[PDB]
Amino acid sequence: MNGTEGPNFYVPFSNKTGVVRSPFEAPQYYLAEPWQFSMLAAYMFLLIMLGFPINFLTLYVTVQHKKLRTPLNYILLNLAVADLFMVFGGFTTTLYTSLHGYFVFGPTGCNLEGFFATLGGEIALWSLVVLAIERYVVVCKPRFGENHAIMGVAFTWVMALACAAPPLVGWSRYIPEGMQCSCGIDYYTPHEETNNESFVIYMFVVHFIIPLIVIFFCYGQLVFTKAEKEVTRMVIIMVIAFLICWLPYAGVAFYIFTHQGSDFGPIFMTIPAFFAKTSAVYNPVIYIMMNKQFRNCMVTTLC
Amino acid sequence: MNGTEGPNFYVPFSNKTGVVRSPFEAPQYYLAEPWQFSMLAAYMFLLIMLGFPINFLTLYVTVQHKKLRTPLNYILLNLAVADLFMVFGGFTTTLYTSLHGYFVFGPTGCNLEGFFATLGGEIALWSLVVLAIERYVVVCKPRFGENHAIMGVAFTWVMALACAAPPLVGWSRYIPEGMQCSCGIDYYTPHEETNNESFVIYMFVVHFIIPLIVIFFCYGQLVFTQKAEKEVTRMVIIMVIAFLICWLPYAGVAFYIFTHQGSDFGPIFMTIPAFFAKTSAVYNPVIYIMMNKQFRNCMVTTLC
Ligand SMILES: *[C@@H]1O[C@H](CO)[C@@H](O[C@@H]2O[C@H](CO)[C@@H](O)[C@H](O)[C@H]2NC(C)=O)[C@H](O)[C@H]1NC(C)=O
Ligand SMILES: *[C@@H]1O[C@H](CO)[C@@H](O[C@@H]2O[C@H](CO)[C@@H](O)[C@H](O)[C@H]2NC(C)=O)[C@H](O)[C@H]1NC(C)=O
Ligand SMILES: CCCCCCCC/C=C/CCCCCCCC(=O)OC[C@H](O)CO
Ligand SMILES: CCCCCCCC/C=C/CCCCCCCC(=O)OC[C@H](O)CO
Ligand SMILES: CCCCCCCC/C=C/CCCCCCCC(=O)OC[C@H](O)CO
Ligand SMILES: *C/C=C(C)/C=C/C=C(C)/C=C/C1=C(C)CCCC1(C)C
Ligand SMILES: *C/C=C(C)/C=C/C=C(C)/C=C/C1=C(C)CCCC1(C)C
Ligand SMILES: *C(=O)CCCCCCCCCCCCCCC
Ligand SMILES: *[C@@H]1O[C@H](CO)[C@@H](O)[C@H](O)[C@H]1NC(C)=O
Ligand SMILES: *[C@@H]1O[C@H](CO)[C@@H](O)[C@H](O)[C@H]1NC(C)=O
Ligand SMILES: CCCCCCCCCCCC(=O)O
């Protein structure tokens, strides 16, 4: 093993010289210079200060205007609430942690940071499943109304909780990653007490591979068979934007899971882990650019 | 003296324990925690990421619409330009300085950080002098056209340079302040080789007190003596109020230090006014959007 395993952490840095200290106890300056932890905090402050208003505005505009009740409108309203949970539930801990260079809040802070980002990202993924089914129904007509949209919204939360909640209560766990200033699923240690390996296989299959299979089946039908054109185009971009956001993190996590103990440093997971946190801001941006109706309503309300 | 004087710095920290090091050589962690320096860097990062777009958009809209050629439009276009100089010329040094906790660029970065913020602040202050005179001529009718607006624009740069430039070339000097991650004028040392004392008086009289006298003279003439003009007059009042909120605490603390050199103050004493004043690069286009119906709709047209 080329890293240091503690009771509830795995530092990607050898302790042969004795300088490794727990990410729940002391700043992690032995593995990165202070100016690197500061860049993480500046990045996290930007996401909070952009993520809070753009998601709140999306929530407010949709609630005020009764014309915005299509399945897309409900799903984007759902993402806005989910994004707001990421910003205030998780990103506030990310910022405070990155300011001090360790999880001052201890494992409670790690649970907060990991759970809300895992929950929010899984809400996004299962929402794309809902939109792919809705597009496949509307376009290929083998109707999808408000009741089916609200049922999909509730469905995303149940599926997201089925992924995010178990690591809080003893099936796997949230553990610091990279420079130890963000948290994720434990791909690093076997840790039979929480049965880590069975959860990782459960997460990639049920919560990463099955949703993609559904999405690309519906897209397979759409391809291989003008208001609706606009919605379909935006969902195409939502799928692409999701894949850019999460594939680097998913790929590196799976590499670590299959190469536990191998030689990797703190930067290896840090960059994908913090890049994935743009997940809380990007979906409303696509909304404004690619929905004429919502953009007009937002300019109406804001002006 | 309760601080430490070096050849080109004044650290508001006692070296009676030997820990003080030059802010051009080593991180200043001995006077503040690293998380404190991280907050300055995150603060400056937000200012850069908001400052560039909202000022570039203000520039782009004004140029793209020939209808925006009133004196107010010219003065706000001039401010957007000066703000961009602040963001790219000075704020980039501030962010890099804050990330490492000291002026890695040495005194040259300090010159960049202080000069562009002093220039942008003085362009704004003299812009309000030009706006107050314009409102006085327009409303009191004692005609202010495009020629006078453009002449006012050049006048603001001349007066701002007369304030920002001398510290670059031997009259006073730019010097780190607070936690040593931004720079201002030397109110800390006599340093008579640069004739510091004479400059501080000149800066506060010609470039502080005189502009305020003109502004409040023109305002008083307005008070103790149609709808389109009322909108502009209202925004000019808020611009002046915003300037005082942004810059009065810094000037007051700076003048207290000038009159109490070597007195018992710490790094936090100037840090907060110094970095709060760096909002000067952002707020003016925000008032413009909120308080000019014509410009706001021109921007929505451009943006959509
Ligand atoms: C990294 O190695 C050092 C050195 O072995 C560990 O520090 C020692 O921990 C033991 C047990 O608490 C103490 O008895 C020693 O006094 C410590 N030595 C020093 C020099 O502090 C350290 O705990 C290790 N880090 C991790 C995360 O395991
Ligand atoms: C603050 O005091 C310390 C301690 O006297 C100074 O450090 C000494 O500086 C001299 C001259 O630069 C060196 O010859 C010594 O080797 C230094 N001693 C130590 C222990 O480092 C330091 O220069 C002072 N700081 C300032 C800004 O004047
Ligand atoms: C694990 C628990 C899962 C949930 C269990 C719920 C209770 C059982 C459901 C019965 C279906 C009864 C109604 C079936 C209606 C099907 C047709 C339909 O929904 O049509 C809508 C219509 O098109 C207008 O939008
Ligand atoms: C902690 C985990 C929680 C997980 C569970 C989350 C469930 C979210 C669903 C809420 C539906 C609320 C009711 C919304 C009703 C809207 C009605 C509407 O707008 O349309 C009415 C129309 O008549 C229709 O046909
Ligand atoms: C459709 C749009 C897609 C857009 C997104 C494209 C993403 C491309 C990269 C994926 C990450 C793959 C991770 C693979 C990790 C292997 C790392 C490795 O082998 O590194 C060994 C080394 O020892 C370690 O330090
Ligand atoms: C900084 C916060 C981080 C890195 C949160 C991590 C969250 C996960 C472990 C999420 C897992 C996945 C998704 C939400 C979508 C893509 C597929 C998964 C299972 C890798
Ligand atoms: C962080 C950057 C700083 C602190 C820049 C400092 C700028 C000045 C020294 C500005 C001076 C003044 C104005 C521009 C307006 C108010 C009067 C002065 C002289 C205090
Ligand atoms: C309503 O009357 C008009 C409202 C116009 C709002 C446009 C303001 C946009 C300012 C730029 C924001 C940049 C933030 C993102 C930086 C990465
Ligand atoms: C540690 O790194 C070395 C060098 O890459 C590698 O040979 C070894 O397999 C790694 N350890 C584990 C447990 O993978
Ligand atoms: C230093 O601080 C003490 C305590 O207030 C004060 O008496 C002394 O005059 C100060 N020195 C200078 C040079 O102001
Ligand atoms: C402008 C887009 C930049 C794209 C950044 C991709 C982030 C993931 C990089 C993965 C590198 C690593 O394994 O550490």
Residue numbers in the entry:
A (entry chain A): 402 to 543, 548 to 630, 646 to 723
B (entry chain B): 402 to 543, 548 to 630, 645 to 723
The study reports:
To characterize the structure of Batho-Rh, we collected TR-SFX data at the Swiss and Japanese XFELs from LCP-grown microcrystals of rhodopsin photoactivated under a regime in which laser-induced heating is low and in which we recovered high-quality difference electron density maps below the maximum activation using a femtosecond-pump laser with a 480-nm wavelength for three time delays of photoactivation of ∆t = 1 ps, 10 ps and 100 ps. The rhodopsin structure, 100 ps later, reveals a slightly more relaxed conformation. The tilt of the C20 methyl increases to 51.3° by ∆t = 100 ps. For the shorter time delay, changes in electron density are distributed in a highly anisotropic manner, clustering in the immediate vicinity of the buried retinal chromophore and propagating towards the cytoplasmic side of the protein through the TM5 and TM6 helices at a minimum speed of 18 Å ps−1 measured along TM6 (1,800 m s−1, slightly above the speed of sound in water and in accordance with the speed of sound in ribonuclease A crystals). This structural anisotropy had completely decayed by Δt = 100 ps. As mammalian rhodopsin evolves along its reaction pathway, some of the observed changes will become more pronounced while others will revert. By Δt = 10 and 100 ps, the β-ionone ring and C19–C20 methyl groups still interact respectively with Gly1213.36–Glu1223.37 and the tyrosines of the Glu181ECL2 polar cage (Fig. 3e,f and Extended Data Fig. 7 (top)), while, for example, Tyr2686.51 and Pro2676.50 of TM6 relax to their initial positions. Already by this early stage of activation, the twisted retinal is freed from many of its interactions with the binding pocket while structural perturbations radiate away as a transient anisotropic breathing motion that is almost entirely decayed by 100 ps.
